[PDB]
Design a protein around this ligand. Structure first.
Ligand SMILES: [Mg+2]
Ligand SMILES: [Mg+2]
Ligand SMILES: [Mg+2]
Ligand SMILES: [Mg+2]
Ligand SMILES: [Mg+2]
Ligand SMILES: [Mg+2]
Ligand SMILES: [Mg+2]
Ligand SMILES: [Mg+2]
Ligand SMILES: [Mg+2]
Ligand SMILES: [Mg+2]
Ligand SMILES: [Mg+2]
Ligand SMILES: [Mg+2]
Ligand SMILES: [Mg+2]
Ligand SMILES: [Mg+2]
Ligand SMILES: [Mg+2]
Ligand SMILES: [Mg+2]
Ligand SMILES: [Mg+2]
Ligand SMILES: [Mg+2]
Ligand SMILES: [Mg+2]
Ligand SMILES: [Mg+2]
Ligand SMILES: [Mg+2]
Ligand SMILES: [Mg+2]
Ligand SMILES: [Mg+2]
Ligand SMILES: [Mg+2]
Ligand SMILES: [Mg+2]
Ligand SMILES: [Mg+2]
Ligand SMILES: [Mg+2]
Ligand SMILES: [Mg+2]
Ligand SMILES: [Mg+2]
Ligand SMILES: [Mg+2]
Ligand SMILES: [Mg+2]
Ligand SMILES: [Mg+2]
Ligand SMILES: [Mg+2]
Ligand SMILES: [Mg+2]
Ligand SMILES: [Mg+2]
Ligand SMILES: [Mg+2]
Ligand SMILES: [Mg+2]
Ligand SMILES: [Mg+2]
Ligand SMILES: [Mg+2]
Ligand SMILES: [Mg+2]
Ligand SMILES: [Mg+2]
Ligand SMILES: [Mg+2]
Ligand SMILES: [Mg+2]
Ligand SMILES: [Mg+2]
Ligand SMILES: [Mg+2]
Ligand SMILES: [Mg+2]
Ligand SMILES: [Mg+2]
Ligand SMILES: [Mg+2]
Ligand SMILES: [Mg+2]
Ligand SMILES: [Mg+2]
Ligand SMILES: [Mg+2]
Ligand SMILES: [Mg+2]
Ligand SMILES: [Mg+2]
Ligand SMILES: [Mg+2]
Ligand SMILES: [Mg+2]
Ligand SMILES: [Mg+2]
Ligand SMILES: [Mg+2]
Ligand SMILES: [Mg+2]
Ligand SMILES: [Mg+2]
Ligand SMILES: [Mg+2]
Ligand SMILES: [Mg+2]
Ligand SMILES: [Mg+2]
Ligand SMILES: [Mg+2]
Ligand SMILES: [Mg+2]
Ligand SMILES: [Mg+2]
Ligand SMILES: [Mg+2]
Ligand SMILES: [Mg+2]
Ligand SMILES: [Mg+2]
Ligand SMILES: [Mg+2]
Ligand SMILES: [Mg+2]
Ligand SMILES: [Mg+2]
Ligand SMILES: [Mg+2]
Ligand SMILES: [Mg+2]
Ligand SMILES: [Mg+2]
Ligand SMILES: [Mg+2]
Ligand SMILES: [Mg+2]
Ligand SMILES: [Mg+2]
Ligand SMILES: [Mg+2]
Ligand SMILES: [Mg+2]
Ligand SMILES: [Mg+2]
Ligand SMILES: [Mg+2]
Ligand SMILES: [Mg+2]
Ligand SMILES: [Mg+2]
Ligand SMILES: [Mg+2]
Ligand SMILES: [Mg+2]
Ligand SMILES: [Mg+2]
Ligand SMILES: [Mg+2]
Ligand SMILES: [Mg+2]
Ligand SMILES: [Mg+2]
Ligand SMILES: [Mg+2]
Ligand SMILES: [Mg+2]
Ligand SMILES: [Mg+2]
Ligand SMILES: [Mg+2]
Ligand SMILES: [Mg+2]
Ligand SMILES: [Mg+2]
Ligand SMILES: [Mg+2]
Ligand SMILES: [Mg+2]
Ligand SMILES: [Mg+2]
Ligand SMILES: [Mg+2]
Ligand SMILES: [Mg+2]
Ligand SMILES: [Mg+2]
Ligand SMILES: [Mg+2]
Ligand SMILES: [Mg+2]
Ligand SMILES: [Mg+2]
Lengths: 88, 275
RNA sequence: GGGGACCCACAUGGCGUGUAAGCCUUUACGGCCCAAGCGUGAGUGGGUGGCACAAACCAGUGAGAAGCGACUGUUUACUA
RNA sequence: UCUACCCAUGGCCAGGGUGAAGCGCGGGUAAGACCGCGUGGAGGCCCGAACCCACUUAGGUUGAAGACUGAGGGGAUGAG
RNA sequence: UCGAAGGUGGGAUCGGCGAUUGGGACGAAGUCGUAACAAGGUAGCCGUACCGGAAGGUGCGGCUGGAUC
RNA sequence: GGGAGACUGGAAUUCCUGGUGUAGCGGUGGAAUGCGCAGAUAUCAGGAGGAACACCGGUGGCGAAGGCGGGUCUCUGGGCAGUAACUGACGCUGAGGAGCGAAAGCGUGGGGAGCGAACAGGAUUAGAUACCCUGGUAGUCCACGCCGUAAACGGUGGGUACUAGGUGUGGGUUUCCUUCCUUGGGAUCCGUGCCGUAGCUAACGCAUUAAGUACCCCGCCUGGGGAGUACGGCCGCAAGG
RNA sequence: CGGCCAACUACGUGCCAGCAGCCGCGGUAAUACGUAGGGUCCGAGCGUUGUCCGGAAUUACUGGGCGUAAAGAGCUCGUA
RNA sequence: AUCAGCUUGUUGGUGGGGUGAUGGCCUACCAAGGCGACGACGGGUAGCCGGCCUGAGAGGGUGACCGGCCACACUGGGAC
């Protein structure tokens, strides 16, 4: 789990402003950092099914948020997906 | 790990091998190679000493630092964990600080980059050879010697090696892979950690060509042997010989261990199987 | 199961190679292309001859069951 | 000096197909697994000469030969 | 050139029959048995593996649609 | 006690070694197969190995469900209360599809103290191929794959809004008799037991954690055998699903 | 012409001979079998048989349930 | 779905022929796709409709006669 230092760094550095925290950009940023970090952990730890449940839940949540961003604005969706370098 | 081969031909249907992803160099050091040849299962006298083996694929020899005692106090990084077929295990060359490179047995899970010390000050990471004065009781050990400084002979099985039990007086107790306990000097040389290639037992042989390559000759069953050649010989049809199995060399199954060895007093009990 | 030979046209066609000449430079036994020249398969139409167009030589018989042996292998040189 | 086995050093296998892992791209996943596309020629793989064998038949059997010849026959990158 | 009928050869569907075998239901009545329903005289049942002419027995795990205390 | 890896502890069983110590020890409704006189049982000292964590431990906690508890570290999921800064229709359920999943079973390679299918004897019965006793092979343990079924039960899919209470438990915020100790008193949200209205139900019964009154979507059923079976199709090496 | 279903007594054989849409009727004294009368229904038609709907809310959109009678998939993530 | 992929004039464009009329109706040349889980392609049955019966209705069953079309004339084709 992310802690205060890097988490505030991320929310500010991908934030639209210096105060907003619940923006979809920051939400997707936190979800992505969590998934890469804990996927790196699960590359070592194989049979943690209770945590793979968290993987799947957070990923479906992410997919819903990305769908919302694409629906609300194509330009912001493209900018986000290009800045994070993912496929969809 | 283990990679299974697809059935391209009826012959190699079942052949599966332990893929050697643990290889770093492909051309062995030319300086340390000594002239060797397949003896063909025969002595210099010309008689076949032991059947079922001989012929095959001529191979080279290289000196392994089994008895590492000459130089101590100097570190060494793992140079390149290469493949030596003359053993089940692998050999990982080392760049010692004096510049004198010797092959050693590669322990389990050794990768390029670890620093290996050989002496009293050596720590507990695998590959460190050190006398029993500087080892905790209960650690898994390999490449174990028998006296303080006469060259190491035992504990080099890939996957299961001797386990130290305890030290009392000037004699130390060693647990065998068979489940036995042997008394040995507290000053012999022994290394820490199991030996690699534990997955080698999962190798599937595959055919006869690999096996003539490896060295063994086809096995001729006694029940079809000729009666003059073998006590199991003869018969019109399939017969077991009408008597308990016996090596055609005269002696049947039974005790073969001649007692009264100098280390016989250094053994507590013999192996018991299938318990 | 079908086509397979020859001639013409498509066709100064496509492909490879590559000269003169052209382009360039750390100028050399230099990289790019390459009219010309040389070699060249493939196909579609039209027509022609024979009984027969892989016509010679060369060059798998196929299918259905069941027994033994998993298969490649080796052996009774000179009865298997 | 044949034959059986092994040891060491050399040599031999025309030609034509089958297309594993691996590799990159587009899908698939969050990562996979997996799905097609282009390189791969791994195989005691396939067809087939040199080479090595000896399954069938005919001849021969006071023969050309004290174990062959002629048609077919098997392996032919390997236990050669 | 097309062209129906005819003949070559192998794949699917519908079938009809087929020695014998496997299973099911209805007869009524007989032998072998005690399975379950009351703590049915070993609590029952479910999943699963083994065993035995037979109902069943046992192992492991799960429920109370189990009675006493 | 949410999950995974590693390290570690004690008690107990069995076995081995060495004392002491003598003719029995184990067994059931009763006895005999069993081990002893080659020294059993008992008991002391030491060691070895494998499994599981008695008390706390409960109609208590967590997890979506199977289920989960000796400690210690390492990394990590889910849920809850307050401030409510921000996003501003992103919510729900989900045919086909995909992932997890009790025990048993299978392959490979290890482990294997206790327990224990199968199988031998001893016992009862007219009869025991069972219930009982003595032994003990798979399995029960570990790693990688597999099968994917349970009375997998709350025999009740999930989500939302509303509808009288009483009595316990857990977690967190507040305030007030105020010692400001106190399950003191009060307010609030979440979880989990018991009894009860109106209501529903054929009855037993449920009763804010509904089977109450509704909304949204999904699966399932149309008399009992045949039969969860044949064929066909899919998965699995097979058992088989 | 037993109850469903408006219409009963006697005579003849008794687990036989027989009736019948559901329950079901005869094992010496049958309103259910056969014959007589008697009554009921219908009528130039009377019954049997076969197909179709209704009652069947027994495929429930109007208008059914899933605790035990048939049923909540083992449970989640999640595409259309 | 105890029928998951179908199709190669198949799909689309251009140029020609074709027919009373536009059109892959037919030919040539270009590109690779169209139809497909809001059930394609497969398997069985069957002429459709105004109507008839039943049912309060919804609905279910059905196509007697008449009438509006459809298709055929012993079987399969072809044309004036
Ligand atoms: Mg946390
Ligand atoms: Mg094999
Ligand atoms: Mg050498
Ligand atoms: Mg001599
Ligand atoms: Mg041998
Ligand atoms: Mg040789
Ligand atoms: Mg090796
Ligand atoms: Mg043998
Ligand atoms: Mg022999
Ligand atoms: Mg002899
Ligand atoms: Mg001899
Ligand atoms: Mg013999
Ligand atoms: Mg015999
Ligand atoms: Mg013997
Ligand atoms: Mg031993
Ligand atoms: Mg040039
Ligand atoms: Mg120039
Ligand atoms: Mg240049
Ligand atoms: Mg001709
Ligand atoms: Mg052969
Ligand atoms: Mg052979
Ligand atoms: Mg020979
Ligand atoms: Mg011979
Ligand atoms: Mg010969
Ligand atoms: Mg012969
Ligand atoms: Mg290839
Ligand atoms: Mg591959
Ligand atoms: Mg051939
Ligand atoms: Mg010959
Ligand atoms: Mg002759
Ligand atoms: Mg002659
Ligand atoms: Mg001779
Ligand atoms: Mg010849
Ligand atoms: Mg011939
Ligand atoms: Mg040949
Ligand atoms: Mg071959
Ligand atoms: Mg060969
Ligand atoms: Mg049939
Ligand atoms: Mg028949
Ligand atoms: Mg009886
Ligand atoms: Mg009973
Ligand atoms: Mg009984
Ligand atoms: Mg019982
Ligand atoms: Mg029972
Ligand atoms: Mg069962
Ligand atoms: Mg049993
Ligand atoms: Mg149980
Ligand atoms: Mg009950
Ligand atoms: Mg683990
Ligand atoms: Mg003792
Ligand atoms: Mg004792
Ligand atoms: Mg053990
Ligand atoms: Mg605001
Ligand atoms: Mg939700
Ligand atoms: Mg959904
Ligand atoms: Mg959904
Ligand atoms: Mg679906
Ligand atoms: Mg579904
Ligand atoms: Mg999966
Ligand atoms: Mg899987
Ligand atoms: Mg178990
Ligand atoms: Mg298990
Ligand atoms: Mg088994
Ligand atoms: Mg296994
Ligand atoms: Mg095993
Ligand atoms: Mg036991
Ligand atoms: Mg038992
Ligand atoms: Mg015995
Ligand atoms: Mg018995
Ligand atoms: Mg089920
Ligand atoms: Mg459960
Ligand atoms: Mg459910
Ligand atoms: Mg709800
Ligand atoms: Mg509450
Ligand atoms: Mg009331
Ligand atoms: Mg009521
Ligand atoms: Mg109540
Ligand atoms: Mg409720
Ligand atoms: Mg209800
Ligand atoms: Mg039955
Ligand atoms: Mg059924
Ligand atoms: Mg089938
Ligand atoms: Mg009447
Ligand atoms: Mg009446
Ligand atoms: Mg009478
Ligand atoms: Mg009358
Ligand atoms: Mg009707
Ligand atoms: Mg409605
Ligand atoms: Mg209904
Ligand atoms: Mg039910
Ligand atoms: Mg259910
Ligand atoms: Mg089910
Ligand atoms: Mg046109
Ligand atoms: Mg036009
Ligand atoms: Mg057209
Ligand atoms: Mg055209
Ligand atoms: Mg109408
Ligand atoms: Mg109606
Ligand atoms: Mg109706
Ligand atoms: Mg109609
Ligand atoms: Mg008319
Ligand atoms: Mg009209
Ligand atoms: Mg006609
Ligand atoms: Mg016609």
């Amino acid at each position: 789990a992310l802690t205060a230092e890097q988490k505030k760094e991320i929310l500010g550095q991908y934030g639209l402003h210096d105060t907003d925290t619940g923006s979809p950009e920051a939400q997707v940023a936190l979800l992505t950092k969590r998934i890469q970090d804990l996927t790196e952990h699960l590359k070592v730890h194989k049979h943690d099914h209770h945590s793979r449940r968290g993987l799947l839940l957070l990923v479906g949540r992410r997919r819903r948020l990305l769908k919302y961003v694409a629906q609300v604005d194509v330009a912001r969706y493209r900018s986000l997906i290009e800045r994070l370098g993912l496929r969809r | 790990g283990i990679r299974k081969y697809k059935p391209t031909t009826p012959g190699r249907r079942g052949a599966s091998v332990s893929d050697f992803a643990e290889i770093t160099r492909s051309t062995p050091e030319k300086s340390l190679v000594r002239p060797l040849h397949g003896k063909g299962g025969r002595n210099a006298h010309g008689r076949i000493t032991t059947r079922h083996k001989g012929g095959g694929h001529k191979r080279a020899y290289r000196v392994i630092d089994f008895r590492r005692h000459d130089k101590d106090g100097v570190n060494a990084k793992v140079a390149h964990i290469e493949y030596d077929p003359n053993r089940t295990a692998n050999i990982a060359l080392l760049h010692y600080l004096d510049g004198e490179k010797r092959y050693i047995i590669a322990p389990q899970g050794l990768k390029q980059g670890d620093v290996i010390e050989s002496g009293a000050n050596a720590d507990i990471k695998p590959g460190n050879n050190l006398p029993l004065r500087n080892i905790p009781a209960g650690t898994v050990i390999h490449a174990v010697e028998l006296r303080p400084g006469g060259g190491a002979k035992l504990a080099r099985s890939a996957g299961v090696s001797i386990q130290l039990l305890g030290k009392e007086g000037t004699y130390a107790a060693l647990r065998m892979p068979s489940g036995e306990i042997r008394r040995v000097d507290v000053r012999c040389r022994a290394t820490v950690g199991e030996v690699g290639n534990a997955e080698q037992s999962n190798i599937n042989w595959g055919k006869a060509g690999r096996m003539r390559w490896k060295g063994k000759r086809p096995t001729v069953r006694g029940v079809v042997m000729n009666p003059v050649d073998h006590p199991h010989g003869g018969g019109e049809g399939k017969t077991s010989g009408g008597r308990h199995p016996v090596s055609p060399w005269g002696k049947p199954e039974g005790r073969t261990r001649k007692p009264n060895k100098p280390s016989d007093k250094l053994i507590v009990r013999r192996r018991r199987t299938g318990k």
